[PDB]
Amino acid sequence: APPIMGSSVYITVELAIAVLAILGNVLVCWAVWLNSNLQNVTNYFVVSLAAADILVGVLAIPFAITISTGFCAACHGCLFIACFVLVLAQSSIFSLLAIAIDRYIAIAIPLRYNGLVTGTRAAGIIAICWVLSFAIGLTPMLGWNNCGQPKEGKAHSQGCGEGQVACLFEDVVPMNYMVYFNFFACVLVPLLLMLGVYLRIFAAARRQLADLEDNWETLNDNLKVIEKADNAAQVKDALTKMRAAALDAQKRHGFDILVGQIDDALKLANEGKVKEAQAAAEQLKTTRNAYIQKYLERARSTLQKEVHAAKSAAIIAGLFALCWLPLHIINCFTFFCPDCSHAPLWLMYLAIVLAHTNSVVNPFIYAYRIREFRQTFRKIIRS
Numbered sequence: 001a002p003p004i005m006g007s008s009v010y011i012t013v014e015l016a017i018a019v020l021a022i023l024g025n026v027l028v029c030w031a032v033w034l035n036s037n038l039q040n041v042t043n044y045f046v047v048s049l050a051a052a053d054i055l056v057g058v059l060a061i062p063f064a065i066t067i068s069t070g071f072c073a074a075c076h077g078c079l080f081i082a083c084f085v086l087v088l089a090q091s092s093i094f095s096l097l098a099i100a101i102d103r104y105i106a107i108a109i110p111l112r113y114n115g116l117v118t119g120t121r122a123a124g125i126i127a128i129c130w131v132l133s134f135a136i137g138l139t140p141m142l143g144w145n146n147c148g149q150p151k152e153g154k155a156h157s158q159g160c161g162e163g164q165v166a167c168l169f170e171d172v173v174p175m176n177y178m179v180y181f182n183f184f185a186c187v188l189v190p191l192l193l194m195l196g197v198y199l200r201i202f203a204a205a206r207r208q209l210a211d212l213e214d215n216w217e218t219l220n221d222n223l224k225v226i227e228k229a230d231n232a233a234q235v236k237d238a239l240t241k242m243r244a245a246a247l248d249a250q251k252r253h254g255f256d257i258l259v260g261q262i263d264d265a266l267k268l269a270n271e272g273k274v275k276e277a278q279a280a281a282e283q284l285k286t287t288r289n290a291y292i293q294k295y296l297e298r299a300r301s302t303l304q305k306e307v308h309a310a311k312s313a314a315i316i317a318g319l320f321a322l323c324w325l326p327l328h329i330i331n332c333f334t335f336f337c338p339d340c341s342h343a344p345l346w347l348m349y350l351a352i353v354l355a356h357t358n359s360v361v362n363p364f365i366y367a368y369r370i371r372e373f374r375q376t377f378r379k380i381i382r383s
């Protein structure tokens with residue numbers, strides 16, 4: 001069949017994707033700009049990512065449509081049209097990695113997060129990452145290309161002019177660059193690193209939330225030990241342990257009271273007065289009920305929110321991998337298996353479209369998983 005028919009479907013689909021990528025991502029950018037509760041370091045990378053997606057719609061998609069035609073062009077101009085999407089993908093990878101790291105810093109060392117991760121450091125990092133993205137993505141423009149070996153038969157058949165080639169992705173971009181440099185080195189490795197960071201984030205969270213329960217359990221069991229003791233020494237044992245575990249957990253009024261009360265009881269227990277120390281240890285229950293238990297519930301609630309936010313970020317990264325992998329895998333087959341028939345055109349189109357679809361998905365994930373974005377989206381849309 002005439003190429004314009006299958007080309008028509010592909011183009012239409014690309015155009016639809018472009019519209020959706022632009023709309024959703026402009027909305028993300030708008031939400032961050034308007035809502036000061038969304039203005040934080042994590043979200044600056046979210047905006048960088050959104051910008052990359054906007055550019056997929058504005059530029060990468062129109063470029064992809066263009067290159068699908070195999071139009072006559074100067075080889076280097078053709079390279080730009082072919083590789084610009086790689087710049088966008090690379091930037092996305094950097095943003096994704098930054099978000100994972102940012103969340104790891106928040107969970108591992110929350111006391112030092114604000115002084116370490118600032119808005120100014122973030123903007124500089126974003127700038128650097130875009131520069132690096134251009135370098136990586138446009139590496140073929142620096143000389144790793146097939147412009148030195150033009151397919152002159154193909155160019156002459158299409159009536160191309162001198163110094164021009166039929167602009168086709170696989171004719172100008174070397175597959176070794178695509179597979180070894182782009183896929184393995186610049187996409188695969190960072191994604192694996194991201195996986196590693198997420199694993200550490202979830203482990204740190206799981207460990208902290210066990211530790212909170214342990215401390216609590218230690219306060220309750222040592223209380224019971226004090227109640228059932230027969231001598232001062234047993235009481236002194238259980239309170240010394242308790243004092244250590246009160247401080248660990250406090251590493252304000254309520255904890256001052258708690259430690260003070262343990263000290264009261266300990267002094268009584270060091271004087272041999274068992275019954276008085278036990279009654280004194282009983283007052284600890286009042287401090288636990290109205291102070292310590294509230295600290296435990298808030299600390300646990302803060303951790304769960306961090307796990308929820310980390311899962312939301314991980315999903316985004318997972319989705320990027322899912323959307324891009326098929327295309328990369330196809331490139332691997334093309335490159336590693338020259339005896340294998342090339343993947344059919346329809347599959348190529350499908351793989352490309354899927355890759356482009358990744359630029360649509362983030363706004364939905366934010367809307368469904370993050371309440372503050374969702375509420376802001378509604379307001380923007382309502383207003």
Ligand SMILES: CC(C)CCC[C@@H](C)[C@H]1CC[C@H]2[C@@H]3CC=C4C[C@@H](O)CC[C@]4(C)[C@H]3CC[C@]12C
Binds near residue numbers: 322325341343344
């Ligand atoms: C990342 C997840 C979703 C897995 C996706 C795997 C996809 C990309 C895999 C699964 C089966 C694969 C195909 C298996 C057989 C062939 C025949 C060969 O002549 C060309 C490549 C081609 C057509 C492969 C292209 C890539 C392929 C379609």
Ligand SMILES: CC(C)CCC[C@@H](C)[C@H]1CC[C@H]2[C@@H]3CC=C4C[C@@H](O)CC[C@]4(C)[C@H]3CC[C@]12C
Binds near residue numbers: 332
């Ligand atoms: C953790 C995962 C997602 C990383 C990506 C796995 C990739 C690199 C793997 C998965 C399936 C693999 C392919 C499976 C089969 C063939 C056909 C063979 O004639 C050449 C290698 C080739 C083409 C492999 C290249 C590498 C490959 C594409």
Ligand SMILES: CC(C)CCC[C@@H](C)[C@H]1CC[C@H]2[C@@H]3CC=C4C[C@@H](O)CC[C@]4(C)[C@H]3CC[C@]12C
């Ligand atoms: C999923 C992750 C861990 C990657 C898995 C990669 C696997 C599928 C890759 C790695 C090395 C690859 C093999 C390397 C060499 C050859 C010789 C070639 O004449 C036929 C394909 C064959 C036999 C490949 C089949 C696919 C292969 C086994």
Ligand SMILES: CCCCCCCC/C=C\CCCCCCCC(=O)OC[C@H](O)CO
Binds near residue numbers: 130
């Ligand atoms: C030649 C054809 C291609 C050219 C196409 C134009 C080039 C677009 C490139 C980069 C824009 C990147 C924008 C990144 C926006 C993120 C900014 C941000 O997040 O702000 C942080 C905040 O200011 C902290 O206080």
Ligand SMILES: CCCc1cc2c(=O)c(-c3nc(C)cs3)coc2cc1OC(C)=O
Binds near residue numbers: 345348352
């Ligand atoms: C079908 C339309 C033109 C075309 C495009 C590309 C393309 O954009 C990529 C890419 N890979 C990545 C990781 C980013 S972009 C790979 O192979 C292609 C092959 C193509 O044409 C073929 C199959 O011969």
Ligand SMILES: CCCCCCCC/C=C\CCCCCCCC(=O)O
Binds near residue numbers: 076127134135138142
């Ligand atoms: C914030 C946006 C940052 C953009 C900075 C641009 C950095 C450019 C760095 C490397 C890209 C090199 C591409 C070479 C183009 C060759 C063009 C030609 O053929 O003349």
Ligand code: NA
Binds near residue numbers: 049053359
């Ligand atoms: Na992206």
